[PDB]
Amino acid sequence: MVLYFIGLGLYDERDITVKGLEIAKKCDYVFAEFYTSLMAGTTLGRIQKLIGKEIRVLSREDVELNFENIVLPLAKENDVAFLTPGDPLVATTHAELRIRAKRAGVESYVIHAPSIYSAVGITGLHIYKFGKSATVAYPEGNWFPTSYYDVIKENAERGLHTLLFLDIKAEKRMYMTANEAMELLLKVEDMKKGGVFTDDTLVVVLARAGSLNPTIRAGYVKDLIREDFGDPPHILIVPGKMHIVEAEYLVEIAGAPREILRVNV
Amino acid sequence: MVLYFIGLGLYDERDITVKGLEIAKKCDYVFAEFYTSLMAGTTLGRIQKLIGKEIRVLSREDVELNFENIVLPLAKENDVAFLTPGDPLVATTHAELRIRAKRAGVESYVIHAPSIYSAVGITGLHIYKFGKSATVAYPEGNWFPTSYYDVIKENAERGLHTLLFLDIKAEKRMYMTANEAMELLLKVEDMKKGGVFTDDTLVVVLARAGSLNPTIRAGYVKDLIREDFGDPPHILIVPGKMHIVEAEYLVEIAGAPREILRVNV
Ligand SMILES: Nc1ncnc2c1ncn2[C@@H]1O[C@H](CSCC[C@H](N)C(=O)O)[C@@H](O)[C@H]1O
Ligand code: NA
């Protein structure tokens, strides 16, 4: 009579922790969602084989509206697991689901897994220097989201890096690329003209973290805006004031122009 | 010819990922460091048994000053692994170790694992709202560093949460407790008087992230400064103004007083 929130990790089914695997293998019922992120290197079938269980995939509606009707009822008489990409509580609203579990008298536990939030470390940028985070959302109809632009501005002013989560529309199999993110940003820049994101802005792209060969690229928007970074998922990062070893890493590892080695202090 | 940076995760020997465990097992040599952090829920003996490889522990100096003469040489003609607590490359200086690998003509790959940076999501606080991070350092002799205090000030002022790592003396196995951290901050508040950290400041304490039974507590300093949060390590968080949902989570899951639902939202 327990509910387990278990992260599956960044790229494939092997990104789950041993703890998460062993516990999942022994749960009576296994549920999962694949709309909060994209695990590019695996399939539902492969996950099921590893875990040795049939997995009922839930939609955003099933979860956000009927979690307490579809999942919780079972966790009252069985060991239930709810799997998610990356870490179940990072950049999702799944934390609120623990409140529902409690109000239903269902104890819940959380098994973490590698998350894109900490994986940014592979970019060479000191993780403690990241400021507020944001999401570049797809414009819809006449509505054009722009808040993520202000986040970059605020962080840049303090010299902090900015992690930009990119939009996703799983049901339509749409995964925003870093290129689309850059195009949207230049459009916002054209509107606000704050000198926040231009063709000369240095950016970093991390694609398919978790795989053995993720794409890690750094450079100016003008050079990267049309570059192919491979299949999604992707994240875009706007560095703040860099330390010398950060720039050196971006150059030696992310193929950035040696030009950035000459850091301004 | 290959070097694998593999994360060990948060608390015990089962916090490594399946991918990390399988790659570790096929390595000819396995190194590890426990000076950046300590796996409090397990032992070196237990980690060695799970991986089935003897583990050569490296000191801070072995890594920072001699990585290239201790680890890379073997990485030249064998598969070598370098284990670190948490997610690889989170520790500030680890990223440049990949540059060293390159310089030595050695290929390197990163196998992620859970990190406290993402695991703090279990506190209910939205990850995107975290700002710059810092470490609470013990004063000593004539040196009294307070930068971590300014970090909290800058984040809070912008409605951002502040993740605070607490000082640790790995070799001597001595951890700073959230209680000690709170006392130190009050003294800094007494020195600077910025109205940043007082008896009325609301804080969150996270102990033993990764465990199935972690300690998550939220409340005002005047009430938590002398509370027993259990064995280390401890993580201290000073939230900024909260989203009603964040506060409800702390109230419902971390035993925070109802008061925060109106004073800190
Ligand atoms: N492996 C990966 N590589 C690059 N970006 C990734 C990624 N996994 C997730 N993301 C990014 O994060 C967004 C989903 S946000 C949900 C994140 C998840 N809880 C975690 O812990 O990682 C994606 O749209 C993408 O921009
Ligand atoms: Na952060």
Swiss-Prot record, chains A, B:
Coiled-coil ranges per UniProt: none
Protein name: Diphthine synthase
Gene Ontology terms for molecular function: diphthine synthase activity
Catalytic activity: 2-[(3S)-amino-3-carboxypropyl]-L-histidyl-[translation elongation factor 2] + 3 S-adenosyl-L-methionine = diphthine-[translation elongation factor 2] + 3 S-adenosyl-L-homocysteine + 3 H(+)
Entry keyword annotation includes Amino-acid biosynthesis: no
HAMAP family for the chain: Diphthine_synth
CDD domains: DHP5_DphB
Additional remarks: The diphthine intermediate is not stable in vitro and readily eliminates the trimethylamino group. It is not known whether the elimination reaction also occurs physiologically.
Subunit structure: Homodimer.
Task of the protein: S-adenosyl-L-methionine-dependent methyltransferase that catalyzes the trimethylation of the amino group of the modified target histidine residue in translation elongation factor 2 (EF-2), to form an intermediate called diphthine. The three successive methylation reactions represent the second step of diphthamide biosynthesis.
UniProt record similarity statement: Belongs to the diphthine synthase family.
Domain of life: Archaea
Gene it is expressed from: dphB
Pathway(s) annotated for this protein in UniProt: Protein modification; peptidyl-diphthamide biosynthesis
UniProtKB keywords: Methyltransferase, S-adenosyl-L-methionine, Transferase
